[PDB]
Amino acid sequence: IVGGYTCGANTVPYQVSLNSGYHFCGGSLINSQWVVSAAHCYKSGIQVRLGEDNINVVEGNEQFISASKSIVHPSYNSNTLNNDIMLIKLKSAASLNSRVASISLPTSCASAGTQCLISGWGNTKSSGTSYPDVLKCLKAPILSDSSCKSAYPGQITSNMFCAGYLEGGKDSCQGDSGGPVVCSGKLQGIVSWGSGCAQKNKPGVYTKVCNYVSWIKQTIASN
């Protein structure tokens, strides 16, 4: 997260870190056994880390649970990043509490102008590299489809939306991939892509979760 703020320990209780020997992506806990992330975060050997703040220090509220399976969206295209969504099942159910809690799926799509919370452990610099170890947060508005398509000609599908600031300076970044965009207590987006980070006229692009609720519910119900 570039141009954000330190969230505060366990203030984003649905935020997970995906770890394969190291943090590589964010995710969102949507029930005791399932995490939603980006399809481009797919790999084998995933451990889901819940209750994290400092991802380099065991602080006492963590739960570490290996994934038993991952399910990449059937229509995910890794070239275009269309349908950039994946489900991860935990080998055992997380113990839910105030610091480890699921986030609700949307019942309707969020509109341009809606204020959201984006979070992650990704790079905090738009030029160069610095990784925070504590969770970072950014409040950002959903942008109009028109402005999104104008910013990224030929690249924005019906399964994507832009959020952030056209002036630059505030954005998600490398390592935030797969993490949450939450608006009015609903998971509306997944950190997907962008051209660099926090660059002028290049806002963050996010997977439009409301398009996938039926797929998510049905997949969970049979797996």
Q: Which residues bind Ca ion (CB under 5 A)?
A: 52, 54, 59
Residue 53 marked in a binding site: no
Whether 150 is catalytic: no
- Residue 54 or 211 with smaller CB distance to Ca ion: 54
Provide, rounded to whole angstroms, the least separation between the CB of residue 55 and Ca ion. Answer: 6
Q: Are 204 and 103 in contact (CB under 8 A)?
A: no
Residue 167 marked in a binding site: no
Q: In which element (H, E) is residue 36 found? A: strand 34-37
- Residue 4 or 51 with smaller CB distance to Ca ion: 51
Whether 126 is catalytic: no
Provide, rounded to whole angstroms, the least separation between the CB of residue 82 and Ca ion. Answer: 34
Provide, rounded to whole angstroms, the least separation between the CB of residue 10 and Ca ion. Answer: 10
Q: Are 13 and 100 in contact (CB under 8 A)?
A: yes
Q: Which residues contact 23 (CB under 8 A, 6 or more apart)?
A: 17, 49, 55, 121, 175
- Residue 56 or 68 with smaller CB distance to Ca ion: 56
Q: Which residues contact 176 (CB under 8 A, 6 or more apart)?
A: 1, 26, 118, 119, 120, 121, 122, 123, 191
Residues 25 and 99: their CA atoms lie apart, in Å, by: 19
Whether 108 is catalytic: no
Residue 177 marked in a binding site: yes
Instruction: Kindly list the catalytic residues.
Output: 40, 84, 177
Residues annotated in the binding site for substrate, as ranges?
A: 171-172, 174-175, 177
